[PDB]
RNA sequence: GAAACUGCGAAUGGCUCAUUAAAUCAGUUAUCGUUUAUUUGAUAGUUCCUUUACUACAUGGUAUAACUGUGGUAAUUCUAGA
RNA sequence: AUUCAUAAUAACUUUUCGAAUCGCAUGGCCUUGUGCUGGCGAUGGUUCAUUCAAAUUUCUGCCCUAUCAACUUUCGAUGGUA
RNA sequence: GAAUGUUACCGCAAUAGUAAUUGAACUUAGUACGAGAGGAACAGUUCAUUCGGAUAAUUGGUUUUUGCGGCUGUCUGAUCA
RNA sequence: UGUACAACGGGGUAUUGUAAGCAGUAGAGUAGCCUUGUUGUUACGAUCUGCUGAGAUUAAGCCUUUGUUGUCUGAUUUGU
């Protein structure tokens, strides 16, 4: 799938294509409203603590 | 293989294990077995059912998953750049608050001014 | 670790205030402080001319 | 002076005549049995709430669009996040 | 023709309205302070009346049929009371 | 199932009986052939039909597990059972 | 006279569908008390909830079993 992520602080958005199944699970399952720990998704995300807003599915 | 769950009560169905059942509305109901199957043929409520994962719920039994959504302590502290603010120069005005006598300069300028001018005003009149 | 298209770059609010209370707090000056003043402009330039767009005050 | 918000209008107009036989409808009445944006005419000195510090009254507060850029959709006057 | 129009006491109200709006003009008094005052408008606002209407509604009137003479009243038909 | 020395274990095979059967789809192949209309075959793969022999994981059936729970009628003073 | 057997038990597993008892500001409503109520309380009250995926049952042709309690020398017959 793909991440559209905004960093408030700076003021910041950027997209990011992901594969790695095994990645995302860390995701499946959850709210938008929940926070999870990055280095489980990208260890460029660790330490990180991302939230969700929502998003666009298929279709 | 894939791992589902009673239509009606609530449980992982391994595989060739358990019934289906259909609806001419295309829907599509699945059983672990005939006790949930004959309820169903007996059109009953498994939320008045109590062995049900449904009624476990809604009558709130082992729910020991969701806790709280917390509500954060924190402030902006995230001096943007305005885009007319020129952020060294907006901690520069943000810092000279005080001196409020510039202001008063000013401003009595300005009243020497606006005197000037209806004055003017008054003798374009006459 | 700073990721670069959201961490490390920075990006600025494309406005400031346009009420009283507003700048007044926004640099937390006075009951009094010439707010006037304290305006934020905008410049651009047409052509070889420039000019700074300070928009208004309400309230 | 675009866009968006806000205010309005969008219920008029127009077309057609299926249904409908004291029902529409005509003409006549009542509203001492009611609604009336609106136009129009007139119409608020008392309202600081332990109303002697509670106090902004030369005037109070929070959002949010348009926009920024980030994105999904095969696709719709689709839309999310920031 | 009214228990009316209105008024008047006691109370009630999740508390309504009583203008933080805006253009044009700039004037006058002075103990000259950005002191005090002041106009032509535009908007929006409580209620009353009005007006553009609306809703109900009174009397009387409608074609061919009796190879339809009885009908309505279960579950409203008629009336009354709350 | 007596008798063959007893008793036990493993075991040969005279004999007797016998059982598997049938079709379709795909390819071949719109090919072969034929003027054309039309239109094949073996191999090969997937399924099925009829029959047979076994099993009963699951599905279904059956319930005296009178195991569980439920309902009426009546008796046990009540309740409980 | 022993990784022997058995009955009991224990556990597992499977089935039912949340036990009796106790409580409850739940309870359609009703009558009564006076302290009159300022949820006033007493009493009748199918049912509802909690203790409760509870209790009940489980080999009789299910598995297991470091427990408990016992059991283990009767009869007859056969010879190349």
């Given at each position: ?12 958005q950027?997209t ?8 995302i ?10 926070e ?5 998704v ?10 969700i ?6 279709q | 293989?894939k791992?589902e ?21 295309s829907?599509?109901f ?71 006598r ?11 001014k ?13 | 670790?700073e ?9 600025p ?24 003043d ?9 052509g ?12």
């Amino acid at each position: 799938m793909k991440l559209n992520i905004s960093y408030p602080v700076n003021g910041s958005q950027k997209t990011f294509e992901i594969d790695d199944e095994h990645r995302i699970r860390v995701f499946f399952d959850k709210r938008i409203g929940q926070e999870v720990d990055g280095e489980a998704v990208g260890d460029e995300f660790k330490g990180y603590v991302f939230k969700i807003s929502g998003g666009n599915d298929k279709q | 293989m894939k791992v589902e769950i009673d239509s009606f009560s609530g449980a992982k169905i391994y595989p060739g294990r358990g019934t289906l059942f259909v609806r001419g509305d295309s829907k599509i109901f699945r059983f672990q077995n005939s006790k949930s199957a004959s309820l169903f043929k007996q059109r009953k409520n498994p939320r008045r059912i109590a062995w049900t994962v449904l009624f476990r719920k809604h009558h709130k039994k082992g729910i020991t998953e969701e806790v709280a959504k917390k509500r954060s302590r924190k402030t902006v502290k995230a001096q943007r750049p305005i885009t007319g603010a020129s952020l060294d120069l907006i901690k520069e005005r943000r810092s000279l608050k005080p001196e409020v006598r510039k202001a008063n300069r000013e401003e009595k300028l300005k009243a020497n001014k606006e005197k000037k001018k209806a004055e003017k005003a008054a003798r374009k009149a006459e | 670790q700073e990721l670069e298209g959201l961490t490390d770059t920075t990006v600025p609010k494309r406005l400031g205030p346009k009420r009283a209370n507003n700048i007044r707090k926004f640099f937390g000056l006075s009951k009094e402080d010439d707010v006037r003043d304290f305006v934020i402009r905008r410049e651009v330039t047409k052509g070889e001319k420039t000019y700074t767009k300070a928009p208004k005050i309400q309230r």
